[PDB]
Enzyme design. Structure first.
Site, PDB file in Angstrom:
ATOM      1  N   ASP A 119      29.457 -21.650 -81.129  1.00 36.39           N
ATOM      2  CA  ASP A 119      28.031 -21.465 -80.851  1.00 36.39           C
ATOM      3  C   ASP A 119      27.315 -22.711 -80.376  1.00 36.39           C
ATOM      4  O   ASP A 119      27.053 -23.642 -81.130  1.00 36.39           O
ATOM      5  CB  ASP A 119      27.321 -20.905 -82.086  1.00 36.39           C
ATOM      6  CG  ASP A 119      26.045 -20.179 -81.730  1.00 36.39           C
ATOM      7  OD1 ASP A 119      25.485 -19.499 -82.618  1.00 36.39           O
ATOM      8  OD2 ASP A 119      25.605 -20.284 -80.561  1.00 36.39           O
ATOM      9  N   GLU A 138      27.942 -21.456 -91.045  1.00 30.50           N
ATOM     10  CA  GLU A 138      27.955 -20.162 -90.351  1.00 30.50           C
ATOM     11  C   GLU A 138      28.518 -20.322 -88.931  1.00 30.50           C
ATOM     12  O   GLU A 138      29.058 -19.387 -88.355  1.00 30.50           O
ATOM     13  CB  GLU A 138      26.548 -19.533 -90.286  1.00 30.50           C
ATOM     14  CG  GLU A 138      25.611 -19.890 -91.468  1.00 30.50           C
ATOM     15  CD  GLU A 138      24.420 -18.939 -91.621  1.00 30.50           C
ATOM     16  OE1 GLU A 138      24.297 -17.989 -90.814  1.00 30.50           O
ATOM     17  OE2 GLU A 138      23.602 -19.148 -92.553  1.00 30.50           O
ATOM     18  N   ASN A 139      28.371 -21.519 -88.382  1.00 29.61           N
ATOM     19  CA  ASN A 139      28.845 -21.870 -87.024  1.00 29.61           C
ATOM     20  C   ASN A 139      30.247 -22.468 -86.967  1.00 29.61           C
ATOM     21  O   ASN A 139      30.692 -22.904 -85.910  1.00 29.61           O
ATOM     22  CB  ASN A 139      27.928 -22.921 -86.375  1.00 29.61           C
ATOM     23  CG  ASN A 139      26.638 -22.357 -85.881  1.00 29.61           C
ATOM     24  OD1 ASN A 139      26.338 -21.187 -86.075  1.00 29.61           O
ATOM     25  ND2 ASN A 139      25.857 -23.194 -85.221  1.00 29.61           N
ATOM     26  N   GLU A 199      37.378 -17.037 -77.614  1.00 31.85           N
ATOM     27  CA  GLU A 199      38.584 -17.242 -78.436  1.00 31.85           C
ATOM     28  C   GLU A 199      38.345 -16.671 -79.828  1.00 31.85           C
ATOM     29  O   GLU A 199      37.228 -16.689 -80.332  1.00 31.85           O
ATOM     30  CB  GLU A 199      38.961 -18.726 -78.564  1.00 31.85           C
ATOM     31  CG  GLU A 199      39.834 -19.018 -79.784  1.00 31.85           C
ATOM     32  CD  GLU A 199      40.182 -20.477 -79.911  1.00 31.85           C
ATOM     33  OE1 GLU A 199      41.015 -20.806 -80.781  1.00 31.85           O
ATOM     34  OE2 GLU A 199      39.615 -21.303 -79.160  1.00 31.85           O
ATOM     35  N   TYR A 200      39.418 -16.175 -80.432  1.00 29.85           N
ATOM     36  CA  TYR A 200      39.381 -15.508 -81.744  1.00 29.85           C
ATOM     37  C   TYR A 200      39.985 -16.439 -82.776  1.00 29.85           C
ATOM     38  O   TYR A 200      41.008 -17.070 -82.532  1.00 29.85           O
ATOM     39  CB  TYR A 200      40.125 -14.167 -81.687  1.00 29.85           C
ATOM     40  CG  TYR A 200      40.606 -13.650 -83.027  1.00 29.85           C
ATOM     41  CD1 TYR A 200      39.716 -13.157 -83.974  1.00 29.85           C
ATOM     42  CD2 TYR A 200      41.958 -13.637 -83.339  1.00 29.85           C
ATOM     43  CE1 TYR A 200      40.154 -12.683 -85.188  1.00 29.85           C
ATOM     44  CE2 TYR A 200      42.407 -13.163 -84.560  1.00 29.85           C
ATOM     45  CZ  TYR A 200      41.500 -12.692 -85.477  1.00 29.85           C
ATOM     46  OH  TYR A 200      41.961 -12.223 -86.681  1.00 29.85           O
ATOM     47  N   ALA A 201      39.314 -16.548 -83.917  1.00 27.04           N
ATOM     48  CA  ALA A 201      39.649 -17.554 -84.936  1.00 27.04           C
ATOM     49  C   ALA A 201      40.058 -16.867 -86.228  1.00 27.04           C
ATOM     50  O   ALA A 201      39.225 -16.567 -87.052  1.00 27.04           O
ATOM     51  CB  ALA A 201      38.476 -18.489 -85.170  1.00 27.04           C
ATOM     52  N   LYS A 219      21.096 -11.278 -84.820  1.00 30.73           N
ATOM     53  CA  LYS A 219      20.018 -10.505 -84.142  1.00 30.73           C
ATOM     54  C   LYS A 219      20.285  -9.944 -82.739  1.00 30.73           C
ATOM     55  O   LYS A 219      19.857  -8.828 -82.428  1.00 30.73           O
ATOM     56  CB  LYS A 219      18.673 -11.267 -84.144  1.00 30.73           C
ATOM     57  CG  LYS A 219      17.452 -10.315 -84.133  1.00 30.73           C
ATOM     58  CD  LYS A 219      16.107 -11.031 -84.294  1.00 30.73           C
ATOM     59  CE  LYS A 219      15.569 -11.562 -82.961  1.00 30.73           C
ATOM     60  NZ  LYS A 219      16.423 -12.630 -82.361  1.00 30.73           N
ATOM     61  N   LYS A 264      31.787 -10.868 -77.979  1.00 29.86           N
ATOM     62  CA  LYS A 264      30.445 -10.995 -78.535  1.00 29.86           C
ATOM     63  C   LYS A 264      29.501 -10.215 -77.640  1.00 29.86           C
ATOM     64  O   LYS A 264      29.170 -10.674 -76.554  1.00 29.86           O
ATOM     65  CB  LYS A 264      30.055 -12.485 -78.588  1.00 29.86           C
ATOM     66  CG  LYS A 264      28.649 -12.792 -79.093  1.00 29.86           C
ATOM     67  CD  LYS A 264      28.503 -14.271 -79.480  1.00 29.86           C
ATOM     68  CE  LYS A 264      27.476 -14.460 -80.622  1.00 29.86           C
ATOM     69  NZ  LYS A 264      27.636 -15.749 -81.369  1.00 29.86           N
ATOM     70  N   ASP A 278      23.203 -27.811 -84.127  1.00 29.64           N
ATOM     71  CA  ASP A 278      23.269 -26.624 -84.998  1.00 29.64           C
ATOM     72  C   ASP A 278      24.590 -26.494 -85.770  1.00 29.64           C
ATOM     73  O   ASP A 278      25.116 -25.402 -85.960  1.00 29.64           O
ATOM     74  CB  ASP A 278      23.026 -25.357 -84.156  1.00 29.64           C
ATOM     75  CG  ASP A 278      22.578 -24.158 -84.990  1.00 29.64           C
ATOM     76  OD1 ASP A 278      22.462 -24.250 -86.240  1.00 29.64           O
ATOM     77  OD2 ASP A 278      22.338 -23.108 -84.369  1.00 29.64           O
TER      78      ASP A 278
END
Ligand SMILES: O=C(Nc1c[nH]nc1-c1nc2ccccc2[nH]1)c1ccccc1
Length: 253
Positions: A148, A134-135, A85-87, A17, A36, A130
């Protein structure tokens, strides 16, 4: 410290969102990371600004291999940017859709990796709350990285323990419920409290109503069962989770 002109935005990586995450590269460094992009309008409108600087707070100061680094942040007139950081290997969500289920060896590995991840955070008095697929991102190693910390403390009920959902005294033991929820999901394909409505999921969770498909081995049931206890106190310690025999029996890493 950084501006947008330091970066080259690449392929889109995701939605959520408040904005999208884009792969990007630091001009003068050639460094690869995930930007992000979040808007100031949407963050103030949906009253969240407060939560964000707490994510940055927590995620900026944290250092662990199984925890997505936050390198920094910045903003302009229109929006706020988080430099992440990119995963390489995407979300565990995606790999679960692709694979439908995981095996005991893949699950326990993740469990271990997640256990240790969570073992570090409680140490600094921090509770994630959380932990959902998705996290959970994946590194080159194929290793689990918890992203997150939006809802981190010093919507989908599916991962929340009876205490939180009921509105009560909650401690770092919530994350063990989550781990149980997660462990079952890896194995079974969907969460043990999944329902068609918010209200029904509430009862399913509030009454710890779960059951096991036949293929779930005995020790899986055992660990999940110990983790999914209505009362926090009965829940293993992360130690015990790492110590559990079905973990060690199957936990590659
Ligand atoms: O920010 C999100 N994900 C990521 C942070 N760092 N690296 C990623 C990432 N996303 C990927 C997608 C596919 C393949 C590899 C990836 N690495 C994010 C934000 C919103 C929704 C989903 C992911």
């Amino acid at each position: 410290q950084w501006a947008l002109e330091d970066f080259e935005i690449g392929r889109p990586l995701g939605k959520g969102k408040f904005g999208n995450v884009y792969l990007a590269r630091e001009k003068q460094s050639k460094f690869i990371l995930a930007l992000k992009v979040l808007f100031k309008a949407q963050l103030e409108k949906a009253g969240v600004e407060h939560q964000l600087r707490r994510e940055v707070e927590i995620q900026s100061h944290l250092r662990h291999p199984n925890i997505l680094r936050l390198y920094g942040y910045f903003h302009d007139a229109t929006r706020v940017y988080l430099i992440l950081e990119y995963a390489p290997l995407g979300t565990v969500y995606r790999e679960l859709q692709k694979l439908s289920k995981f095996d005991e060896q893949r699950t326990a590995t993740y469990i271990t990796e997640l256990a240790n991840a969570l073992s570090y955070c409680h140490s600094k008095r921090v509770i994630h709350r959380d932990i959902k697929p998705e996290n959970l991102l994946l590194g080159s190693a194929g290793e689990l990285k918890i992203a997150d910390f939006g809802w981190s403390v010093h919507g989908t009920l599916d991962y929340l323990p009876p205490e939180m959902i009921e509105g009560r005294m909650h401690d770092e033991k919530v994350d063990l419920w989550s781990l149980g929820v997660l462990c079952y999901e890896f194995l079974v394909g969907k969460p043990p409290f999944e329902a068609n409505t918010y209200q029904e999921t509430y009862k399913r969770i509030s009454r710890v109503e779960f059951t096991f498909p036949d293929f779930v081995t005995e020790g899986a049931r055992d660990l999940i069962s110990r983790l999914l206890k209505h009362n926090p106190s009965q829940r293993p310690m992360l130690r015990e989770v790492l110590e559990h025999p079905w973990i060690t029996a199957n936990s590659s890493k």
